[PDB]
């Protein structure tokens, strides 16, 4: 019935990582009111007119995971048509009275390049420190939600009325209606939104938390799309594009390292490999009745 109730249903479709809704405020084709002839028309009767936007329509913004499966002839590719078909078939089966869906849009991604000059402590190794920086920043930018079992949410003190508030029924008799991966915590769902402005202090305060980092002498950020620099950068804040999610641009960042007015070398490619290796894993699987409902004693 509400927005979060739909986000939780969309996130439970294989291939969807996150989702957002947005209201349609400008409707195409444009519709104008002719007072002299008392009728609606496509043309502006006065060339100074308003467009009579009708209400009740949503715009769905999707975040898809990138599978990169191996083809039959030996290459690597990605295909999302089936996910779009499943999302459409699901949404058109759950709309309410007097509402419809205007379109479905796939979000892109921006890379954030970071330029910095860091002072290290004497007992430090720049390589691991830089690995930790990349890991912490990437965790900062793109969090992921966890799926729970009913029992482990009951062990947190949440009454079933707050857990089943917006879910559609999974079983009817002995027939499964749809497949489900578990429960999502509302409090964590409400905290994941799309930002528009990035502030450097949010990175300053987290870079200052890595052991071995003494002080930050320089820090700035820049926006990359399609591998090309879009702007010159700014020391204190950066504005994001409407259609894109921020990620960490490891290949376009550069962090210099100095110990007591002396420069220290860092093997950047080994750092990149170590960064890829130390990424945390997650669990996303299909669950059965014992973990989804509560039977009669």
């Amino acid at each position: 019935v509400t927005e979060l109730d739909v986000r939780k249903r969309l996130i439970d479709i294989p291939g969807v990582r996150n989702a957002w809704l947005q209201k349609v405020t400008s409707y195409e084709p444009n519709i104008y009111v002719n007072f002299s002839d008392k009728r609606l028309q496509y043309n502006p009767p006065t060339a100074e007119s308003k467009t009579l936007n009708p209400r009740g329509l949503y715009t769905v913004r999707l975040d898809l995971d990138q599978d990169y499966r191996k083809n039959a002839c030996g290459q690597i590719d990605r295909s999302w048509g089936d996910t779009l078909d499943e999302v459409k078939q699901v949404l058109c089966d759950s709309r309410n009275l007097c509402e419809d869906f205007a379109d479905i849009v796939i979000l892109g991604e921006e890379e954030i390049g970071i330029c910095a000059d860091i002072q290290l402590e004497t007992n430090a190794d720049a390589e691991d420190v830089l690995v930790n920086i990349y890991v912490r920043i990437q965790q900062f930018l793109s969090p992921r939600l966890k799926f729970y079992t009913l029992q482990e949410l009951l062990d947190k003190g949440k009454s079933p009325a707050e857990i089943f508030a917006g879910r559609p029924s999974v079983f009817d008799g002995e027939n499964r209606l749809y497949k489900s991966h578990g429960f999502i915590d509302t409090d964590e769902l409400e905290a994941l939104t799309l930002p528009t402005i990035l502030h450097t202090s949010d990175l300053y305060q987290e870079i200052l938390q890595v052991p071995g980092v003494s002080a930050i002498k320089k820090l700035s950020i820049a926006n990359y799309i399609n591998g090309l620099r879009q702007t010159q950068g700014h020391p204190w804040y950066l504005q994001l594009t409407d259609q894109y999610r921020p990620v960490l641009g490891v290949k376009t960042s550069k962090i210099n390292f100095f110990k007591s007015e002396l420069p220290i070398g860092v093997d950047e490619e080994e750092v990149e490999r170590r960064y890829y290796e130390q990424q945390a894993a997650y669990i996303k699987t299909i669950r059965d009745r014992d973990e989804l409902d509560i039977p009669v004693p």
């Binding site: 019935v1 509400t2 209201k23 209400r55 009325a161 917006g166």
Partner: protein, 99 residues
């Protein structure tokens, strides 16, 4: 009483029955409430529009059975409480409803 009502409105507000019972349970200091369908209220004119698709309006009465006020025959509700009820109801209803 509480649980039998919840087993019917599921904690969501889509109909006259749902708006009324979700208020009387959360705010004990109300005595009576009425839900007006497709109606809008204009603050500047103090006029109610009887036909306005997309809006909902409620009118409430305070309890007054254990306290005394300055006008017991035509009582009023405090302005901070009128806003506290609008926020709660906006979170458990459709995004396209104005309350």
């Amino acid at each position: 009483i509480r649980i039998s009502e919840r087993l019917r409105h599921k904690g969501r507000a889509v109909a006259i029955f749902d708006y009324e019972r979700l208020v009387l349970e959360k705010f004990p200091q109300i005595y009576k409430v009425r839900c007006i369908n497709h109606g809008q209220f204009d603050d500047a004119q103090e006029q109610l529009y009887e036909l306005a698709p997309g809006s909902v309006t409620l009118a409430v009465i305070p309890d007054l059975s254990q306290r005394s006020t300055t006008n017991d025959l035509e009582p009023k509700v405090n302005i901070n409480l009128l806003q506290e009820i609008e926020k709660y109801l906006a979170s458990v209803s459709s995004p396209w409803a104005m309350i």
